[PDB]
Amino acid sequence: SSNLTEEQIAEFKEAFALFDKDNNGSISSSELATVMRSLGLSPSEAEVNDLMNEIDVDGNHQIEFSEFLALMSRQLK
Ligand SMILES: [Ca+2]
Ligand SMILES: [Ca+2]
């Protein structure tokens, strides 16, 4: 769309939680990995930690909502 900010953030917040299976405002390797495991992929730490890392602004084996917004921010249009 052409309007994000609080609009994209709010939408992301709901999505972030989806990734975190504990709602602790934080996501670990498996946490973000369970987002595709139930679909039919069962990725290994390599792919699991990869996702959590690609967004881990600090690099602590997990990412927080705000971090999910830094890497998320849509992708193309
Ligand atoms: Ca958590
Ligand atoms: Ca983090």
What domain count does the chain have?
Answer: 1
Query: Which ligand has its closest atom nearest to the C-alpha of 68?
Result: 2
Dist. CA 70 → ligand 1 center (Å): 18
The CATH number covering residue 29 comes to 1.10.238.10
What the block records as the tokens of 51 is 């996702």
Confirm whether residue 47 is marked as ligand binding. Answer: no
Rounded distance between C-alpha atoms, residue 11 and residue 18, angstroms = 11
> DSSP per residue over 6-57, as a string?
HHHHHHHHHHHHHH-SS-SSEEEHHHHHHHHHHHH----HHHHHHHHHHH-S
Give me the helix-helix angle, 45-55 and 29-40, nearest 10°.
120
**Residue 26 has what DSSP assignment?**
E
> What are the distances in angstroms from CA 55 to CA 10, 21, 43?
18, 17, 17
Q: Which domain holds residue 60?
A: 1-77
Which technique was the structure solved with, according to the deposited record? NMR
